[PDB]
Enzyme design. Structure first.
Site, PDB file in Angstrom:
ATOM      1  N   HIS A  81      -7.619  -5.994   0.786  1.00 28.95           N
ATOM      2  CA  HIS A  81      -6.373  -5.342   0.864  1.00 28.95           C
ATOM      3  C   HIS A  81      -5.368  -5.470   1.885  1.00 28.95           C
ATOM      4  CE1 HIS A  81      -3.590  -1.877   0.056  1.00 28.95           C
ATOM      5  NE2 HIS A  81      -4.063  -1.252   1.182  1.00 28.95           N
ATOM      6  N   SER A  85       1.024  -0.957   0.030  1.00 29.67           N
ATOM      7  CA  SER A  85       0.121   0.085  -0.002  1.00 29.67           C
ATOM      8  C   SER A  85       0.815   1.234   0.151  1.00 29.67           C
ATOM      9  CB  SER A  85      -0.892   0.059   1.197  1.00 29.67           C
ATOM     10  OG  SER A  85      -1.972   0.921   1.273  1.00 29.67           O
ATOM     11  N   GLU A 137      -9.364  -5.714  -3.673  1.00 31.47           N
ATOM     12  CA  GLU A 137      -8.665  -4.602  -2.837  1.00 31.47           C
ATOM     13  C   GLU A 137      -9.559  -3.635  -2.526  1.00 31.47           C
ATOM     14  OE1 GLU A 137      -5.062  -3.937  -2.683  1.00 31.47           O
ATOM     15  OE2 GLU A 137      -4.098  -5.303  -4.414  1.00 31.47           O
TER      16      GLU A 137
END
Ligand SMILES: *[C@@H]1O[C@H](CO[C@H]2O[C@@H](C)[C@@H](O)[C@@H](O)[C@@H]2O)[C@@H](O[C@@H]2O[C@H](CO)[C@@H](O)[C@H](O)[C@H]2NC(C)=O)[C@H](O)[C@H]1NC(C)=O
Ligand SMILES: *[C@@H]1O[C@H](CO[C@H]2O[C@@H](C)[C@@H](O)[C@@H](O)[C@@H]2O)[C@@H](O[C@@H]2O[C@H](CO)[C@@H](O)[C@H](O)[C@H]2NC(C)=O)[C@H](O)[C@H]1NC(C)=O
Ligand SMILES: *[C@@H]1O[C@H](CO)[C@@H](O[C@@H]2O[C@H](CO)[C@@H](O)[C@H](O)[C@H]2NC(C)=O)[C@H](O)[C@H]1NC(C)=O
Ligand SMILES: *[C@@H]1O[C@H](CO)[C@@H](O[C@@H]2O[C@H](CO)[C@@H](O)[C@H](O)[C@H]2NC(C)=O)[C@H](O)[C@H]1NC(C)=O
Ligand SMILES: *[C@@H]1O[C@H](CO)[C@@H](O[C@@H]2O[C@H](CO)[C@@H](O)[C@H](O)[C@H]2NC(C)=O)[C@H](O)[C@H]1NC(C)=O
Ligand SMILES: *[C@@H]1O[C@H](CO[C@H]2O[C@@H](C)[C@@H](O)[C@@H](O)[C@@H]2O)[C@@H](O)[C@H](O)[C@H]1NC(C)=O
Ligand SMILES: Cc1ccc2c(c1)sc(-c1ccc(N(C)C)cc1)[n+]2C
Ligand SMILES: Cc1ccc2c(c1)sc(-c1ccc(N(C)C)cc1)[n+]2C
Ligand SMILES: Cc1ccc2c(c1)sc(-c1ccc(N(C)C)cc1)[n+]2C
Ligand SMILES: Cc1ccc2c(c1)sc(-c1ccc(N(C)C)cc1)[n+]2C
Ligand SMILES: *[C@@H]1O[C@H](CO)[C@@H](O)[C@H](O)[C@H]1NC(C)=O
Ligand SMILES: *[C@@H]1O[C@H](CO)[C@@H](O)[C@H](O)[C@H]1NC(C)=O
Ligand SMILES: *[C@@H]1O[C@H](CO)[C@@H](O)[C@H](O)[C@H]1NC(C)=O
Ligand SMILES: *[C@@H]1O[C@H](CO)[C@@H](O)[C@H](O)[C@H]1NC(C)=O
Ligand SMILES: *[C@@H]1O[C@H](CO)[C@@H](O)[C@H](O)[C@H]1NC(C)=O
Ligand SMILES: *[C@@H]1O[C@H](CO)[C@@H](O)[C@H](O)[C@H]1NC(C)=O
Ligand SMILES: *[C@@H]1O[C@H](CO)[C@@H](O)[C@H](O)[C@H]1NC(C)=O
Ligand SMILES: [Cl-]
Ligand SMILES: [Cl-]
Lengths: 527, 526
Positions: free
Chosen positions: A436, A196, A323
């Site tokens: 995610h 991320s 995600e």
């Protein structure tokens, strides 16, 4: 006893017994001077030396944050909150080392994500203890400043120039270059990897001239700087810090005076007005993040990439299947982790309302049209799974693919992955699917621990991912074995070949979500 | 060879066709000649004539402009009228097998031509072959086109609009009061047309005055929900007042506007029809069908959704490359003689011409939806795409969308996809299977083996001829050639259609679904 001499002094560690072997850990080693009141918002300043022997036997403080409070007691949201006590005195790193001591080990350095507004290197899921044992690598993770304390931007002003948290990461890389050889590491076999915002940070170190000699290769998990949330323009960053100045009651007229106020406000009150600096925010908003500071970044990053002005190096990029889902329970109407969250068409449009505030109604309508060609038009979750794809496609997948495409066009091997397995212990409902940040557990090898209630197939998959990540680090090729292994081909803009990662069967396929990514790269900008 | 109609006697001629004989009656008046006081009015019923009428040659075609973009070129000139032009044009033709049948079904052809041109007398409409091999009576009418047939001063009986549509309905009324004297079945009557004719056929399914005058309908590359078929009332009135200004007839009230127009030379009306609408496209229909409150009791999309139409089985279809015939008439970079490869910008220029009133985002939205190339290396990409853009939006997607709604109300709908390019077609190869070049196959022109066609085209034509005739007789174009495809029925979910080509005949589902969803679900919001 376990001691080793650093260029900043001696430091002592601790033995850990893992899978029948031992790993030596050095937890919370300081790499920069505490960015306390005078230095706050300044670039990290280098260490001098310390007295006697630092005991690196406990994780250090996390840098100052807000915390996720939405669902108390729930492991799914709690596992990402900082598990140390929070402070500005927070520039520390960790070092895991295989025992017996390696002569010239390859080094992996983890950069945590968290939207540039949260994160710490001491979470259980970032435990490098396993990687050091399984693949005999050295793993390092560092705490970098986050939020307004980390990326407040008045570019041109050394009191708060922007991109300090990135400069925290960079000096940690310098420390590894200066010291990890003592630890038995190879400073010329060093691989960055993050997820991320950590993957976005990793991607920008490929652009920054200062980082071009501090690492060898890079791995980008569910993040890249060309994502819509990663980089903020020069003067919206300044508009942000002028607004924070008023919100805190110290708008003054010349810049260094306004920093003088902010240095005297308690860290809390700075932290609780970070959210009001933007007028119209989404769940995916980065209030204070990376910017074009003229030091770390000499231009807008999309340009630098288009012109090939980056480090020439192998990279391993990839994404998860679902995600977008993690962000809908944080504002999208009709969504909850306690329902199955089947919405209707208007709830869907009200969802784009939230994630695309400033987009015209003609643009929202075109997004809807492109994601409503149901293969089966009677299944309720159609609109539920659509918005999760919209959020995920536009914010992670299609930028990551587009970044790899542009990066591979300059002659370096790139490898793309599509992580498709939902963890058996995923505490979120299964309508959120392969979420995610839930590939990290497999990257660090947590399913290798037999006492953790992971399935046997999940240990096999984790054992595979770990071998390939470490093999990419040592050799620039994410192979597993010469024999009995699915070959991972290179990503090149023509065929765009990626590798799927799950427990059923890993296989090669082409042009990941190409019909969806074409919309986001070639039509949505003109809207 | 004479037959006593209810208005008099007519004399016919013997045609020798395929060793057999078919009797033809060419040019019988079915209405009073629409001249002088009667211009712009609905067709007036005719009184009996005491003499014998000579139906021995094709009658005059209705007044129309003539395609002279390519002088000498057989491909453009084969659609021009082959008889003299005159306002005295309301006549019909009847072909009848020999030996004369006594209740054959009858097929009535309504020609196309954008409601601007066309005539029953063109070689590609020769009904003699259909009457010979399938033993059906074939009838074709001449209806007024252009402003002389569709100029609309709405509410005014002196120029009510859809006069050419009433011309067709009066021809349909004629066959029902006279075809029995010819050996035909007045209650087994099938309408089939093409382009504006198929559009016209679809509007006969809506008109209550025509509910009584036919059985089934076959609609070739045309339907009223096509964007070019019906013009709104405001559009029609602006268009009428513009023609008045151009011909020097802008006047005080409408009945003075009309008397001035009745005195204009016919060519002073046809040569100003082009300037009547400011944003004309190649497919622009200057004067066409309108909602007059007489032939069409209101807006057609309405009546269709509400369910007020003749309930019967239809036969709908398109050709693979409908839009290519129009790129030659104004799209930059195109030509009958080039290979006609265009740039992306030349494509964007072509969009401006076919979509003059659409916003920039709207065109950009069309560009994106047709630029998902399977192979980007191919230079022909942009030329094929605009041909498909024109074809889908104007013909294919309306025809499918029409068939879906019609089949919904429990009717047997059969859809075809004509894919074979005539080896004789004079246009270049890049235009593919063009608009209107399935007609000679439907009329059985490849059946006479001295006309240079492939024998594959003879087999292909003879089968099309058989299913067209059997749909007329029976209501299912089955073809009894042993192993041959069962033409199933169009239905809203599976949406199955039949392919037509010499190689084979397959059966498929959801024609141009990804493309047509754009034109029906997104483009009406740009
Ligand atoms: C870090 O180390 C020790 C803490 O205890 C360690 O002692 C080592 C000798 C070794 O056996 C290791 O396994 C063990 O965990 C602190 O040592 C200081 O000095 C003597 C050394 O034996 C201790 O007996 C004292 O209790 C301790 N404190 C004093 C003398 O004030 C050492 O100080 C510690 N570092 C810091 C900064 O606290
Ligand atoms: C209704 O008609 C008017 C006028 O139509 C003119 O158009 C010429 C091409 C020609 O046929 C002439 O005989 C006729 O009078 C249209 O108004 C025109 O609109 C355009 C914009 O598209 C303007 O640029 C013109 O200046 C303007 N002219 C006049 C005289 O008004 C009008 O567009 C048309 N359609 C409507 C109102 O929907
Ligand atoms: C650790 O490995 C590195 C390389 O991975 C060694 O450093 C260099 O090795 C390469 C040869 O491929 C060259 O860049 C130089 O010859 C080496 N650098 C020098 C000599 O400064 C390094 O020697 C290894 N260290 C140990 C202790 O084995
Ligand atoms: C993955 O593939 C690379 C491809 O070469 C292998 O790399 C070799 O590794 C050996 C160590 O076993 C080195 O001595 C060689 O110098 C390497 N060769 C090259 C060209 O880099 C690597 O061994 C493979 N990994 C596994 C586990 O099979
Ligand atoms: C139509 O407009 C004309 C405009 O003059 C009108 O025509 C007049 O008709 C009346 C009676 O027929 C006569 O006095 C004149 O011969 C005509 N006018 C002129 C100037 O000669 C007619 O009345 C209008 N029709 C309407 C308003 O319905
Ligand atoms: C690894 O191989 C397993 C079977 O062993 C292999 O032995 C080869 C010599 C050949 O005979 C094949 O029968 C086999 O591929 C296979 O069952 C596993 O699925 C493979 N596992 C992985 C992770 O690749
Ligand atoms: C108030 C508050 C508390 C925690 C918190 C946030 C806000 S926002 C956030 C976050 C995480 C990821 C991302 N991206 C991947 C763009 C953006 C934001 N966390 C973890
Ligand atoms: C208060 C608030 C608002 C938004 C918001 C959060 C908290 S937290 C969050 C989020 C942050 C991190 C993660 N992972 C790292 C798995 C997943 C989701 N969003 C999008
Ligand atoms: C000047 C001139 C001459 C002839 C002529 C035209 C213009 S336009 C035309 C025409 C044919 C078909 C259609 N559609 C069914 C869309 C529309 C227009 N013809 C036959
Ligand atoms: C001058 C001018 C302008 C436009 C234009 C023509 C002439 S002609 C034409 C056309 C007419 C009829 C036919 N068929 C009967 C197949 C095909 C195309 N358009 C669309
Ligand atoms: C730590 O490392 C190994 C563990 O097997 C051992 O040789 C060494 O003595 C240990 N040191 C301790 C436990 O203090
Ligand atoms: C999901 O939960 C929220 C909050 O409890 C609620 O507003 C919403 O109606 C729920 N969805 C469904 C389908 O019940
Ligand atoms: C009808 O055709 C006959 C054929 O002999 C011809 O003599 C006659 O002139 C025609 N009718 C009229 C009214 O001229
Ligand atoms: C003609 O055809 C119809 C068949 O539908 C029939 O009703 C009629 O009796 C037939 N015979 C005549 C009119 O002599
Ligand atoms: C096609 O022909 C037209 C006019 O003849 C011309 O504008 C265009 O350049 C030509 N394109 C070719 C020859 O590729
Ligand atoms: C068949 O071909 C020749 C010339 O290529 C032509 O003279 C003959 O008339 C053709 N048949 C027609 C035109 O029906
Ligand atoms: C087609 O159908 C009609 C009645 O449905 C029937 O008379 C005819 O024999 C059928 N076609 C064949 C058998 O090929
Ligand atoms: Cl090794
Ligand atoms: Cl083609």
């Amino acid at each position: 006893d376990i001691i080793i001499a650093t260029k900043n002094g001696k430091v002592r560690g601790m033995n850990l017994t893992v899978f029948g072997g031992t790993v030596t850990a050095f937890l919370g080693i300081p790499y920069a001077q505490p960015p306390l009141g005078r230095l706050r918002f300044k670039k990290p300043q280098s260490l001098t030396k310390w007295s006697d022997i630092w005991n690196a036997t406990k994780y250090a403080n996390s840098c100052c944050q807000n915390i996720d409070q939405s669902f108390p007691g729930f492991h799914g949201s709690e596992m990402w909150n900082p598990n140390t006590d929070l402070s500005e005195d927070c520039l520390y790193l960790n070092v895991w080392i295989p025992a017996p001591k390696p002569k010239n080990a390859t080094v992996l350095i983890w950069i945590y994500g968290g939207g540039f507004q949260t994160g710490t290197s001491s979470l259980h899921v970032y435990d490098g203890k396993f990687l050091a044992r399984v693949e005999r690598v050295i793993v390092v993770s560092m705490n970098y400043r986050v939020g307004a304390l980390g990326f407040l931007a008045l570019p041109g002003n050394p009191e708060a120039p922007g991109n300090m948290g990135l400069f925290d990461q960079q000096l940690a890389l310098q420390w590894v270059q200066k010291n990890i050889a003592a630890f038995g590491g190879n400073p010329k076999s060093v691989t960055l990897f993050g997820e991320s915002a950590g993957a976005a940070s990793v991607s920008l170190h490929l652009l920054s001239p200062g980082s071009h000699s501090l690492f060898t290769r890079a791995i980008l998990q569910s993040g890249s700087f060309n994502a819509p949330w990663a980089v903020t323009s020069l003067y919206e960053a300044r508009n942000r810090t002028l607004n924070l100045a008023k919100l805190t009651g110290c708008s003054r007229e010349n810049e260094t005076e306004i920093i003088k106020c902010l240095r005297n406000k308690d860290p809390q009150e700075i932290l609780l007005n970070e959210a009001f600096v933007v007028p119209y925010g989404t769940p995916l908003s980065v209030n204070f993040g990376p910017t074009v500071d003229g030091d770390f970044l000499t231009d807008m990053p999309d340009i630098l990439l288009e012109l090939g002005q980056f480090k020439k190096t192998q990279i391993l990029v990839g994404v998860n299947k679902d995600e977008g889902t993690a962000f809908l329970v944080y504002g999208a109407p009709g969504f909850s982790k306690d329902n199955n969250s089947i919405i209707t068409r208007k709830e869907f449009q009200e969802g784009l309302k939230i994630f695309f505030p400033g987009v015209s109604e003609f643009g929202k309508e075109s997004i809807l049209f492109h994601y409503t060609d149901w293969v089966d038009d009677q299944r309720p979750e159609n609109y539920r799974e659509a918005l999760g794809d919209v959020v995920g496609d536009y914010n992670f997948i299609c930028p990551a693919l587009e970044f790899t495409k542009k990066f591979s066009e300059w002659g370096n091997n790139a490898f793309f992955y599509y992580f498709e397995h939902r963890s058996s212990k995923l505490p979120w409902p299964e309508w959120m699917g392969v979420m995610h940040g839930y590939e990290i557990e497999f990257v660090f090898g947590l399913p290798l621990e037999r006492r953790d209630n992971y399935t046997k197939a999940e240990e096999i998959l984790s054992r595979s991912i770990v071998k390939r990540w470490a093999n990419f680090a040592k050799y620039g090729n994410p192979n597993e074995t010469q024999n009995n292994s699915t070959s991972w081909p290179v990503f090149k803009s023509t065929e765009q070949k990626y590798l799927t990662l799950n427990t059923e069967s890993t296989r090669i396929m082409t042009k990941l979500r190409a019909q969806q990514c074409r919309f986001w790269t070639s039509f949505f900008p003109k809207v």
